[PDB]
Design a protein around this ligand. Structure first.
Ligand SMILES: Nc1nc2c(ncn2[C@@H]2O[C@@H]3COP(=O)(O)O[C@H]4[C@@H](O)[C@H](n5cnc6c(=O)[nH]c(N)nc65)O[C@@H]4COP(=O)(O)O[C@H]3[C@H]2O)c(=O)[nH]1
Ligand SMILES: Nc1nc2c(ncn2[C@@H]2O[C@@H]3COP(=O)(O)O[C@H]4[C@@H](O)[C@H](n5cnc6c(=O)[nH]c(N)nc65)O[C@@H]4COP(=O)(O)O[C@H]3[C@H]2O)c(=O)[nH]1
Ligand SMILES: Nc1nc2c(ncn2[C@@H]2O[C@@H]3COP(=O)(O)O[C@H]4[C@@H](O)[C@H](n5cnc6c(=O)[nH]c(N)nc65)O[C@@H]4COP(=O)(O)O[C@H]3[C@H]2O)c(=O)[nH]1
Ligand SMILES: Nc1nc2c(ncn2[C@@H]2O[C@@H]3COP(=O)(O)O[C@H]4[C@@H](O)[C@H](n5cnc6c(=O)[nH]c(N)nc65)O[C@@H]4COP(=O)(O)O[C@H]3[C@H]2O)c(=O)[nH]1
Lengths: 72, 73
């Protein structure tokens, strides 16, 4: 389950989190989902984010877990 | 049309017509743990799955769902 902590994500500097921040905003606007605390995404979004980040999905997961943004 | 289904409108649909969609609905709800209201929205791509389960065209399925009042114009 890919579950993002939105309050934490917002405080990661753009230089690390910029593309994930923008990706999450596009999901929120498509959904009209502005709950303010959590955003769960499709497993297939991980694949997409990995392409954007130029990292493997597993390395990306580790990075987001290490930022405390993604639950482990 | 966005597939926003009214599970209560659907319940008033005769079982021969409604069955497959009620079964599918129950499967999505279980996969999600989503049991908190009478509206179920599903993916646009899910219309293909339902088309296959009913062996009806997607367009035909959408039109009838709308007639049963289950789906929004
Ligand atoms: N609980 C749950 N509900 C689901 C799931 N999949 C679809 N739905 C519901 O069905 C809707 C339509 O799904 P869609 O055609 O894929 O249309 C979706 C999709 O194209 C996109 N979208 C929303 N969220 C995500 C996401 O996490 N990842 C991706 N790749 N696209 C998303 O924006 C659309 C509108 O999203 P919504 O307004 O939320 O509306 C969603 C939502 O009510 C699911 O795995 N779990
Ligand atoms: N706004 C929002 N909240 C989130 C998200 N991720 C997790 N949650 C929270 O965590 C629970 C489970 O989320 P879930 O796995 O999406 O699983 C959800 C989801 O599958 C579904 N669900 C609830 N509300 C909606 C809705 O408005 N539209 C759709 N399409 N599905 C919903 O019901 C399941 C259980 O919902 P709850 O336990 O009552 O409540 C939620 C919700 O409090 C997110 O991306 N957006
Ligand atoms: N074909 C189909 N499959 C469905 C539908 N609903 C749920 N599933 C399946 O059940 C898994 C869990 O749904 P979830 O707990 O709501 O957990 C969902 C949920 O919280 C959220 N999500 C994904 N897509 C959407 C979306 O379009 N709208 C919203 N509001 N939430 C979404 O992301 C989580 C993970 O998504 P997935 O990895 O795809 O994992 C999804 C997906 O495989 C559906 O309407 N159609
Ligand atoms: N992954 C996930 N996403 C969530 C959750 N709660 C809300 N959302 C997202 O936040 C959007 C707005 O939810 P809402 O207006 O509060 O209120 C919702 C809700 O009251 C209702 N609704 C429509 N479809 C569904 C559905 O399949 N299940 C549920 N439980 N409610 C739905 O219609 C409004 C819009 O539904 P959506 O188009 O789905 O759009 C939802 C959905 O994208 C959640 O627990 N998990």
């Amino acid at each position: 389950k890919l579950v993002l902590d939105l309050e934490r994500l917002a405080h990661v500097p753009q230089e690390k989190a910029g593309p994930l921040q923008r990706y999450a905003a596009t999901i929120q606007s498509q959904r009209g989902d502005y709950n303010g605390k959590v955003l769960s995404i499709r497993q297939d979004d991980l694949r997409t984010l990995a392409v954007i980040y130029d990292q493997s999905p597993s390395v990306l997961t580790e990075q987001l877990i290490s930022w405390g943004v993604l639950d482990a």
